[PDB]
Design a protein around this nucleic acid. Structure first.
Lengths: 144, 185, 55, 67, 75, 142, 141, 19, 100, 56
RNA sequence: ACGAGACUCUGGCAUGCUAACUAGUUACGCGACCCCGGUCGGCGUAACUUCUUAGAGGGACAAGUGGCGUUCAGCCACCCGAGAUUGAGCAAUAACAGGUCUGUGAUGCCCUUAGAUGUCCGGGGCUGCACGCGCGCUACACUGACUGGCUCAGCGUGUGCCUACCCUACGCCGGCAGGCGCGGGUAACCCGUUGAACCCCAUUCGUGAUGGGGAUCGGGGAUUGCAAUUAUUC
């Protein structure tokens, strides 16, 4: 009713990461590497889930649609500009590259850069600043 | 109205300045009892024009400190309003009377000065200034990184400081100074 | 040959195209109100163009 | 501080030297006397020397002079 | 320094104590029943509205930043 | 019959309000909207101070409409409260005997001079070597 | 008598937003889930049916000062672009979402077009705003 | 004039001509 | 008939003289001339640095240039006020005749 | 009423000089020095460098 | 005799003074809705300058009163009031081997000159990064953040001889950054009644390195340009 519900799930491993289910539902999914502040509100605005409560009170089987929204973006009328992965040199398909997928794609486009020995690739390999900053008076405490 | 100019919904009369020293340098009464703290200004043109300024306006201006809150007088009059409504629910007294006794029982009567460190007496206008300043600074720190809001901390400061309850930031700084002044008197 | 190597590098903008109408110097230029005058030359010819110091 | 310079005083003194009998006490009546009897190209200087002409006039009725 | 962990929806004991103490108080704001029920200011913004519906505690004035409630009138 | 119209202006800063006072039944309209619904409402009592010092019998048969421009949310309120006050004293100077006008002038001037006599202060010129007027940048030594 | 300037404007848009929900003939677009309401915004509009408050707003801005175009309405819906690390700026609002309000209120004849360029208010929409403040007037009596 | 030089530039143009 | 004599100058006294000269002087010919309208003074500011190099305290000059503009309006054909404008003109004041 | 001639630069040496020729009245300060004081500056090329000629 | 002062500009006021389809206001005919009446930056107009613009004159002097001052010179109060110490500019004598030969077709001398130190074109570099300093900007949150709703500015600029690069209304298409027709303005005429932020009002957030903070970083879309990689910006 108004008290703590039973069948309560505090930790909720959704795409292998222990989501703390004590936060409002859009800001609870942000722990997954590939969904931020913007992605979460839309993927819970697509399917009618009330944005009033925590992830502790939601049904275990009601979030079966949620992962299939989060994994398959374009299938539920999500626009093509909204997606982080857009027109990739390798596959060409648009995606939302999530927790482990993202981490792989970073190093895939980093190895693509490094292996052909482009200037952009080597500053990633040497841990320098790639987008042309002034590294005269910055990078003191993180280095040596 | 010619009956009484009630401070929004607060009392003008039955607000006694029960100290026979600070009666001049406390503006709460008779000629300076208005509908709001907010004035035109112009109390900072001469030396002793700042004393005749109503204390609701003095405590209003004292509450906007530390850079981000500078020149937010519409926020601070609203903080005063909330912290005044709170005192009437928690005490059972006119918040102006609780304020008057809070200013009077907070102002330090002696201080120390480099002439070598010698104890001197304190002017009644500095007593009013230091009383107001210590109370606002106690409220300011008390509501920092805390769920307890500024009007709740400000009211808790003014109740404890009216009582001499010793939990006040203002009373603890006052008792420190008077003891440290007495140390070399 | 070298007549494609005079001003074949297109001059349609930048600091190399425009300069002061007295010296031909490329720095401290004033284009405000179509002066096209370097700040040193303007402060020299301020009195006799019409500009006055009041404040 | 409101000290009048020597320029004000040695114009005011010679204004009374020549035209004493025309002058009076109040500032406004003999500010208008200072119009014709003195060519002044500055209305602040005019009111400054007119103001001193009145002050020098008030002390004449007490007795002696500077010269 | 020292961590403060809170409740996101009410236990039996928390809903029990706010039924028998919060109507019996003078200063009823969400920032005071966040201190003494060890709940959030969010959960108090539902609790004090749920006690407004029950009609035990009376509102004084409602601003954006702060709202205040009080005990009953007796007569 | 003969119009008893008075137009009196007022100002605190670059904000300026001019109150057209007319012989009517009671009306205070700031740019079309009345006194009760001009924001801020925290600074509504600073607009009520012309009213409650005098009551509603000095504002018995006057229709004082305002037109305000320039300045800001606080300065515009200080322009209004000045103008509608001055405007009533001007209407009660011309068309009513000056004895009652002096009786009103006593209360309005004794309360706050700003209600009758305006504020002369404006903003200052910024001098170089600093961001404000009377402030300089950081003098770094060595 | 009562008109729209004699009521608190802070509850008029809410009262007229409730009325246009009751009518429900406004021709709303199909990007209301995903669209961000200007370039200086961080989150989505928190009102689940946010579009029904701005159609309630724009008509009021056309009732008071008529001749509000597309660019003029984006100028009204301006905010503080808090630019993270660099100093902030003023940000003029988004065109299409406010253009799809004055297109949405063109179909239902409550705002109109005239000379001088720009949209303006139809002489029936004046009446249709006068009888929203009519309920708001006696909601505080 | 076809290009119709403004009043803030006409005073400038005569000024620089004099110089 | 709608002829505007547009008197623009930098100095104030040459502009007051020449404008009053076509009002006071244009009295005893019984002309229908409308009173003098003054446009807001356009104050051209150029702030330069005093120093040729970058050395010393940062001192700035603030060169101003106040230019004024005035209107004379009348309901009569061209030559009736070309009699008036052609005589006693100033180099300092620029005067432009708008016949339409 | 008065004048001031200053001829600055090289006057027999590798250590610069300025001969100053004052007489009568001369104002520097105030706004009157716009219409009272008439100032002129010239260069002149003598064989050791440039002399500057300042007349008031 | 100079400097200080006096001086010039600017700010405050003036129901008095002068004037206004490139500024308005009041009253009036008309038009809209309005439960005899209100609002209208909706249309048009016979007076007037309170608002506005910039002119000319006034206005303020320690002038009135009271003390102190040998006591002139003056000082401090108080009345009266728009101001009873607004803010700048200008600024002497004598100097410093300050800085500038990279502002000058002002510059002596020294060095170059077809082996260029002249002149232009193609690329790179001034930004390179174990470090050390200075001026800054954003912050470390609840007096706050995010999302809605509400109501007001003042200094300026603009179609460039070179000179294109103006400013931008209105209506379509685009999530957006933008694109496309169709105007207005050489400007008290248009952008523009410059609907600026903060503040104010209502929502959620809850002391947690959290929705504080937004550096670094991956992917994609237009704009400027002849050309953006060492990422122009967005």
């Amino acid at each position: 009713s108004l008290v703590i519900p039973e069948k309560f799930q505090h930790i909720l491993r959704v795409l292998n990461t222990n989501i703390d289910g004590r936060r409002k539902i859009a800001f609870a999914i942000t722990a997954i590497k590939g969904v931020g502040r913007r992605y979460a509100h839309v993927v819970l605005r697509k399917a009618d889930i009330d944005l009033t409560k925590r992830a502790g009170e939601l049904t275990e089987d009601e979030v079966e649609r949620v992962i299939t929204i989060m994994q398959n973006p374009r299938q539920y009328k999500i626009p093509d500009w909204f997606l982080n992965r857009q027109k990739d040199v390798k596959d060409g398909k648009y995606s939302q590259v999530l927790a482990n997928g993202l981490d792989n794609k970073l190093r895939e486009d980093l190895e693509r850069l490094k292996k052909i020995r482009a200037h952009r690739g080597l500053r990633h390999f040497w841990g320098l600043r790639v987008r042309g900053q002034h590294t005269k008076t910055t990078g003191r405490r993180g280095r040596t | 109205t010619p009956d009484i100019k009630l401070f929004g919904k607060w009392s003008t009369d039955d607000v006694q300045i029960n100290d026979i020293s600070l009666q001049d340098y406390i503006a709460v009464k008779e000629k300076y009892a208005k509908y709001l703290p907010h004035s035109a200004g112009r109390y900072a043109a001469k030396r002793f024009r700042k004393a005749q300024c109503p204390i609701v306006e003095r405590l209003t201006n004292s509450m906007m400190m530390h850079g981000r809150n500078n020149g937010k007088k519409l926020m601070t009059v609203r903080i005063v309003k909330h912290a005044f409504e709170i005192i009437h629910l928690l005490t059972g007294e006119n918040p102006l009377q609780v304020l008057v006794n809070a200013i009077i029982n907070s102002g330090p009567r002696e201080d120390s000065t480099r002439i070598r460190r010698q104890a001197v007496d304190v002017s009644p206008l500095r007593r009013v200034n230091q009383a107001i300043w210590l109370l606002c600074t106690g409220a300011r720190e008390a509501a920092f990184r805390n769920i307890k809001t500024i009007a709740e901390c400000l009211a808790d400061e003014l109740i404890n400081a009216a009582k001499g309850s010793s939990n006040s930031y203002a009373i603890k700084k006052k008792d420190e100074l008077e003891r440290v002044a007495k140390s070399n008197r | 040959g070298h007549q494609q190597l005079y001003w074949s590098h297109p001059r349609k903008f930048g600091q190399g195209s425009r300069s002061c109408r007295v010296c031909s110097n490329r720095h401290g230029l004033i284009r405000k109100y179509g002066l096209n005058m370097c700040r040193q030359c303007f402060r020299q010819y301020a009195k006799d163009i019409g500009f006055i110091k009041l404040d | 501080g409101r000290v009048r310079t020597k320029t004000v005083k040695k114009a005011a003194r010679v204004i009374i030297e020549k035209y004493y009998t025309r002058l009076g006490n109040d500032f406004h009546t003999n500010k208008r006397v200072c119009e014709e009897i003195a060519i002044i190209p500055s209305k602040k200087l005019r009111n400054k020397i007119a103001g001193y002409v009145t002050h020098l006039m008030k002390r004449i009725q007490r007795g002696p002079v500077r010269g | 320094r020292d961590k403060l962990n809170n409740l996101v929806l009410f236990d039996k004991a928390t809903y029990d104590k706010l039924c028998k103490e919060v109507p019996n108080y003078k200063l009823i704001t969400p920032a005071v029943v966040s201190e003494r029920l060890k709940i959030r200011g969010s959960l108090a913004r539902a609790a004090l509205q749920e006690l407004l519906s029950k009609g035990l505690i009376k509102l004084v004035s409602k601003h954006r930043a702060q709202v205040i409630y009080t005990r009953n009138t007796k007569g | 019959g003969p119009l008893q119209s008075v137009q009196v202006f007022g100002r605190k800063k670059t904000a300026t309000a001019v109150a057209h006072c007319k012989r009517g039944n009671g009306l205070i309209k700031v740019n079309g909207r009345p006194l009760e619904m001009i924001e801020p409402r925290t600074l509504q009592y600073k607009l009520l101070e012309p009213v409650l010092l005098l009551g509603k019998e000095r504002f018995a048969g006057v229709d004082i409409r305002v037109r305000v421009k320039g300045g800001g949310h606080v300065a515009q309120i200080y322009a209004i409260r000045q103008s509608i006050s001055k405007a009533l004293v001007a209407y009660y100077q011309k068309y009513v005997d000056e004895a009652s006008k002096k009786e009103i002038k006593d209360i309005l001037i004794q309360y706050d001079r700003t209600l009758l006599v305006a504020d002369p202060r404006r903003c200052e010129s910024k001098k170089f070597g600093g961001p404000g007027a009377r402030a300089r940048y950081q003098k770094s030594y060595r | 008598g009562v008109t729209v300037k004699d009521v608190n404007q802070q509850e008029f848009v809410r009262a007229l937003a409730a009325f246009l929900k009751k009518s429900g003939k406004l021709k709303v677009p199909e990007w209301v889930d995903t669209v961000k309401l200007a370039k200086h915004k961080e989150l989505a509009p928190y009102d689940e049916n946010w579009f029904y408050t701005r159609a309630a707003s724009t008509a009021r801005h056309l009732y008071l000062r008529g001749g509000a175009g597309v660019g003029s309405m984006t100028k009204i819906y301006g905010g503080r672009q808090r630019n993270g690390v660099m100093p902030s700026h003023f940000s003029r609002g988004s065109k299409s979402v406010a253009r799809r309000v004055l297109q949405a209120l063109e179909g239902l004849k409550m705002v109109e077009k005239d000379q001088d360029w720009g949209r303006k208010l139809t002489p029936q929409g004046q009446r249709d705003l006068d009888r929203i403040a009519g309920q708001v007037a006696a909601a505080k009596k | 004039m076809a290009v119709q030089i403004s009043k803030k530039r006409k005073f400038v143009a005569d000024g620089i001509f004099k110089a | 008939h709608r002829i505007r004599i547009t008197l623009t100058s930098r100095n104030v006294k040459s502009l007051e003289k020449v404008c009053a000269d076509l009002i006071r002087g244009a009295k005893e010919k019984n002309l229908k001339v409308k009173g003098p309208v003054r446009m807001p003074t356009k104050t051209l500011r150029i702030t330069t640095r005093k120093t040729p190099c970058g050395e010393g305290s940062k001192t700035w000059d603030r060169f101003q240039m106040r230019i004024h503009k005035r209107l004379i309006d009348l309901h009569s054909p061209s030559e009736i006020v070309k009699q008036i404008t052609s005589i006693s003109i100033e180099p300092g004041v620029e005067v432009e005749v708008t016949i339409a | 009423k008065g004048c001031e001639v200053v001829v600055s630069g090289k006057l027999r040496g590798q250590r610069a000089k300025s001969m100053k020729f004052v007489d009568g009245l001369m104002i520097h300060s105030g706004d009157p020095v716009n219409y009272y004081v008439d100032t002129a500056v010239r260069h002149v090329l003598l064989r050791q460098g440039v002399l500057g000629i300042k007349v008031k």
